[PDB]
Amino acid sequence: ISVRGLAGVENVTELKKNFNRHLHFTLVKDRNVATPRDYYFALAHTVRDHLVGRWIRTQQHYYEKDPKRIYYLSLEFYMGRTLQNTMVNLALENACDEATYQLGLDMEELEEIEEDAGLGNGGLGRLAACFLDSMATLGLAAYGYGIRYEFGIFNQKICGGWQMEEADDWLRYGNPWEKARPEFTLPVHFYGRVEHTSQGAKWVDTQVVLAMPYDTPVPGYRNNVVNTMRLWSAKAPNDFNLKDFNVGGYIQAVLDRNLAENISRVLYPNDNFFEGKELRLKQEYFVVAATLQDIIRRFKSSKTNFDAFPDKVAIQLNDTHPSLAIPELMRVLVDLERLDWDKAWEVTVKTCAYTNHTVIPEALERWPVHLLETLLPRHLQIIYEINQRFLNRVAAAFPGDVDRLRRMSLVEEGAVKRINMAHLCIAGSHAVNGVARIHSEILKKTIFKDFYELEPHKFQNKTNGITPRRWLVLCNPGLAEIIAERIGEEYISDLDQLRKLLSYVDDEAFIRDVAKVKQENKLKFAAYLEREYKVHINPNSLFDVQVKRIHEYKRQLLNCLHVITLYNRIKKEPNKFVVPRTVMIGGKAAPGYHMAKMIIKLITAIGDVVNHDPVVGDRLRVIFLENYRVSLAEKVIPAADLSEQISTAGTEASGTGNMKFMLNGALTIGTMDGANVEMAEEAGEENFFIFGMRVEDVDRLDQRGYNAQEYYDRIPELRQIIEQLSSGFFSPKQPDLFKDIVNMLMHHDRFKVFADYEEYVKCQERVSALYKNPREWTRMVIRNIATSGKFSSDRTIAQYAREIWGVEPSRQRLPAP
Amino acid sequence: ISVRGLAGVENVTELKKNFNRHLHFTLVKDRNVATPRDYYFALAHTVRDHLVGRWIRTQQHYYEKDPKRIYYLSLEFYMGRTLQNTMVNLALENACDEATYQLGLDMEELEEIEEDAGLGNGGLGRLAACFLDSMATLGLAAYGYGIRYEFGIFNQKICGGWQMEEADDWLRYGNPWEKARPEFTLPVHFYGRVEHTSQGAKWVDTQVVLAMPYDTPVPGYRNNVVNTMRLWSAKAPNDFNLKDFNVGGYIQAVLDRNLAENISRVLYPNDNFFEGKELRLKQEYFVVAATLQDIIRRFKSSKTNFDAFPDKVAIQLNDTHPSLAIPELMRVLVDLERLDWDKAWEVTVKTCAYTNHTVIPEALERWPVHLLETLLPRHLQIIYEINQRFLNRVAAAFPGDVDRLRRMSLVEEGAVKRINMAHLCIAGSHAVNGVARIHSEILKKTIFKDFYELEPHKFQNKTNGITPRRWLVLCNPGLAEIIAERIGEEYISDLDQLRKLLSYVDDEAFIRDVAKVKQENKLKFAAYLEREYKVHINPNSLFDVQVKRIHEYKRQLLNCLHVITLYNRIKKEPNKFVVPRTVMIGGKAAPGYHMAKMIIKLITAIGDVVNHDPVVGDRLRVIFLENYRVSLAEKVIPAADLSEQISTAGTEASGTGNMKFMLNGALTIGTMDGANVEMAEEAGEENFFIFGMRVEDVDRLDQRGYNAQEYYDRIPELRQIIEQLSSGFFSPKQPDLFKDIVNMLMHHDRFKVFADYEEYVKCQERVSALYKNPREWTRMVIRNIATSGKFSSDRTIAQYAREIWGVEPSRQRLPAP
């Protein structure tokens, strides 16, 4: 049925009886009242049972061997569903498929019942999830640490073409994958004040909030390793949250417990602008304070000289969100352990490493000093001391460079004083990395130039990657099978072996097969679109898709302009042939991001005109993919023909969706941005659809001055589109509905959409020409898939391991379960 | 080892392997890191597995047979721990005892880890729990319906002799006994307004709150019947609690979900005064609205003529708390089902029955009309209509009795209009009952005289009872064994058979045995007092205990006066012999009940003086039992010698603790109040220590006028005590600390403590005389235990069943598991 593993006779029999066991004793049901949800749960429990054995030994192994431990701190872990992924890494997929079949059930139908663990916004969160999988697969003693939000990323509903946010109550029916561990609750402090007494500083009169951990198993690919992802939940103490006597009301006191537990209540959906809310700072300290106590406690056991701390501990900071870990490690070392400053700092720097994910200014965390002053007084004092000593180092290296001193400070003066968390991370980490070659170069040349000049050795690059298990074997078993048929299975944990596929580029059989799975994928998706969303699309057209969070820099708007152009060209010459296209755009907009929400409305408004024009027929379809999330990505990507990666050169740090499409047989049309540069470089520019300005062209335009009017004046096709928008062509009842978009495009477009319009349209024409030649299109596809091996997160993790953490990856199977 | 069941070789082997199974797959632990808590959980899960089979068939049986269903609605279910009770009703106690022994564990130690399900204040809540057990044991198709509070009754801490309330986070480590059932969530409405349109009224624009049920199994005694207790949890909808757009903040919207979920957050600890808070009214409608939908849905399946509704459904209201069930049944029948009023009312009255638990005015629920108007507009309209028609019935029966009309109204005029919920319950129920003969007579003669005259057939009596399984076999296995040794085991589900023990009253062997288990119980308790509370008491002294919630009417104060007298007599004649006594007083005070909290302080203040007076020696010890609750009651009661049931005649509706002591070998000193009257009547007044005024004497005193000064003037011993209190004898640092108590005792004592002082002290002297004669004391004990059969809740339930519900109890075993 596929290399989803063997379906042993004893294995299938055992699975079946354990499924019935759980349905009865665990769910307390019987085949006569069980709903598909109960069936999903019976199965999830049966599969989960196979992890326990390995989970306990893996952890036991690390205790005995005592290897260097890697701690990945992130406020986001975009996990998605875990049932199928678990069957895959455990080689149980076929056995479970058979067993459920015999019990008279459809496994695929049950898999659709599982909720997505949406504890992330997009790329940054999903990277942590791919990393956890690769770390387990490469046998590293790694732990994922984060917050267990009861509400993850909101569920997107489109109402009247507008995005509506709805709470994601993913825990409603329970999470069979987690294991609560109250025996490990830890106390986290907030507020209070600092007392300077004889022997050191003391943080007192603090408000206490408890951190209760929940452990989720992270199984490596067929190596019997099961690592742990520990997520903290906020809990109020039963005393003072009732004990601070002297009136107020007993009832009120217990009802007010929810104020402390609000910390882990919801994931912040803000993607673009840095708000600076107090609740968010709390979430950040909460995950940091609880995690470090856990890290140090585990170290103290190992095998009190903290000199060996960096030899046993590695802490990777996923962006600046968990940056408080630096001053928090110092506080503990200096205040509680009583280490001298200098010794404590040496230790801290040697164990911390920081990862940057963007260069846009509005996203940078710059916390008001008055907030840190009230909430974390001692940390502010430690940050000031860190700054003092750091600036003393700068002054000594660049004497008299008074301006460099203010540029490099961790403290920003002005309206309100703020602490630049990124500067804090650079000063307190022994390594700082970008997520793609071009991005890492930009960090050295621009944003962190002063820091690079001070300590060049700190800056590195670690190009992002995706996990081939979830992003190929799991979502595209068909494609995975035909590949395995020719080169074997070893590539699933060694993606570089995909290169061997280059020798089949002229294979008439392979070409036919590659083209066949893609057609099957498209038919399956086209069906799902009608089943769950009733719309109907032509599976013979080119599937043009751009799925990612809605941002001005991602330029979904540039895509919209192309779509309107196509429609206008058809209306001009109705009886001329054009390659049919089904362009799908999907993604969530941050709730307070007005422009982003205006763009979602435009997309649906275009579809309302285009999808009902009789002259267009089935030649052009504009579809907005509702509620884009991980489980939905697993469906669209394998079915896409054209992947849109059109950000303004220099704005997308790396991108990972782009790597997901390349691995699944879609061709890419994009700019020389982020990882796009390395993908084209791996597959050859001839096998890529590159267009638009390069980072340098954008700069040149900026020196000169970007004037949108110039393009409006010289391109009739562009002018016509803008007039359609202004006249209400796409919004009859509300003629001025899109005045904000037109206004922005013409007067304040930071992303030069117009500047790339002409080259983008022409490039899109070359894509349509190649699609007209099935054989050649597929041959190009084979060359993209065959050279995508570099983008596996196993490669990324092996580099972090070797160049940053100081640990050697191992593909050695753990001593059975 | 006892008639805790057989310990079969195959049974013990099976238990052991399943314990290891759960420890591994369920707890995800291994013998090397397991804590006693993990062990308790492994066992709880192993025991719980034996209920599933029976639970599913019992429910399946009721579906097929379709018997009349009994629904017990209560806002309180004081369950206590369920591990041991489950082993008892399943005859697994000895097998589990053996199995854990072989695994090298102490079962008793593990049992102590379980948390008490403290979803009740005291007697009313614990009665519901005893009733659920008896209903299962008598094979009735009964369901307990209530609210699943995440915080039950507060944990009492004594600080400086003062009571401190602390949140009871009983769900912290999880509840292995419940089974969440989200597939049965139901919507409950609040607020809104009423619309009168062509065909009937309509309740619109209501705020919606979801009710998610959690099912807990209620196993009958060795009959394989497992009934269900369904507890509702409040959940917010994910839409409007985020969907009511137009600014406010996305974050805020999801954080504000806690406002709707606050409904099931905490149990109201108010014992004495009726507050009338909005949150409480919500809790009451919430349990009523969700339960009725569930009841009707189950009826519609059965086997739409609601004419047969009362033949298939019986709804017992535990006090007026769930009284909204009456107008809510009408709303559904009239508004939704479209039945004519009269037909709907006939149905409602025939299915509802009401139980009264007190006659004190301050406890009666009288809801302000403005509250019902805002929160439940339609119900207010239905209540007014009910009142109209009812008063029309009264006017027709007593023409011209204009005053009877105002006395009987459900609507009370005055300062603020209120709805008298008790009047509502009488009008809408076919049966109204008191909980003890004297109490039921008082209801007819006083409080409900007008209603009794109108419909005499409605009023009944159903004297309370306690379950012999938990209150004998479970907490006093020793005593249960020696009884079984002589008369067999049949008495555990037929307590009347205890009468057979009368023929052993002169048995030298039995006398020695009865006296021996009590001494063993006292030594065990004396040890527990030092282990967990470090204090040290003499196990040879008389154990004088009064445990129950602190109320002025229970007169813990009358007890305190006796204690001070004893101490004063010893100080007067130090070298005179007196029967050593260890008087223990325990109970929680409602948080806002000032007087009650002042009484707790007095008790501890007395102990501070008495327990450290060298002249007193070990002759007198005053101990305050911290955090009195069900699990603690299971410990003290079996170890008590003297049970204090000294409420003012006419104030304690029934009492049940009194029945718990009688069954466990303690002698009773009390007034002719509540059930005390029937207990003395069953055992013979010669075998009881009765004293004080009878209900009539209290009345006579009231006509005359109660003047405390009179007693103060004529009793020197009493005068001396009051002067000790006023002078600061018991509060050196704060001489006037107890001025409020003295002031109340002298000028506003509604409970005539002084009036019963002299007779109480003299009676206490007769108790001390009998204790000096071991043989005779024990012989009297045998006569109390031998005549306590009447007080089993099986008898109570059999009467409710026959005289109110119209169903026949059955002791028939269900067809195996």
Ligand SMILES: O=C(NC(=O)c1ccccc1)N[C@@H]1O[C@H](CO)[C@@H](O)[C@H](O)[C@H]1O
């Ligand atoms: O929540 C989990 N999770 C797991 O057992 C588990 C096992 C393997 C992998 C992931 C989760 N288990 C739960 O642990 C509580 C407390 O011990 C039990 O009462 C409950 O019945 C059980 O399902």
Ligand SMILES: O=C(NC(=O)c1ccccc1)N[C@@H]1O[C@H](CO)[C@@H](O)[C@H](O)[C@H]1O
């Ligand atoms: O997704 C984010 N950032 C956020 O989601 C985010 C979350 C909270 C606050 C600010 C930004 N960054 C993304 O991280 C991925 C993985 O490195 C990159 O490939 C991508 O180019 C970048 O934009």
Ligand SMILES: O=C(NC(=O)c1ccccc1)N[C@@H]1O[C@H](CO)[C@@H](O)[C@H](O)[C@H]1O
């Ligand atoms: O909470 C319970 N309770 C019981 O199974 C149970 C069984 C018999 C008697 C009382 C409770 N079970 C729980 O049900 C959830 C959802 O199906 C599972 O994910 C979880 O592992 C299981 O322990």
Ligand SMILES: O=C(NC(=O)c1ccccc1)N[C@@H]1O[C@H](CO)[C@@H](O)[C@H](O)[C@H]1O
């Ligand atoms: O316990 C209560 N009442 C409350 O706890 C209560 C709870 C909420 C609001 C008001 C009273 N009543 C008690 O119910 C038992 C059982 O019928 C009687 O024996 C006892 O005499 C009576 O006082």
Ligand SMILES: *Cc1c(COP(=O)(O)O)cnc(C)c1O
């Ligand atoms: C891969 C992924 C992302 C990241 O996509 P980009 O194109 O890098 O912005 C975002 N969301 C989901 C659901 C993903 O699977």
Ligand SMILES: *Cc1c(COP(=O)(O)O)cnc(C)c1O
């Ligand atoms: C039995 C019981 C009660 C009721 O006692 P009374 O003496 O009737 O007031 C109260 N609390 C607990 C814990 C009980 O077990």
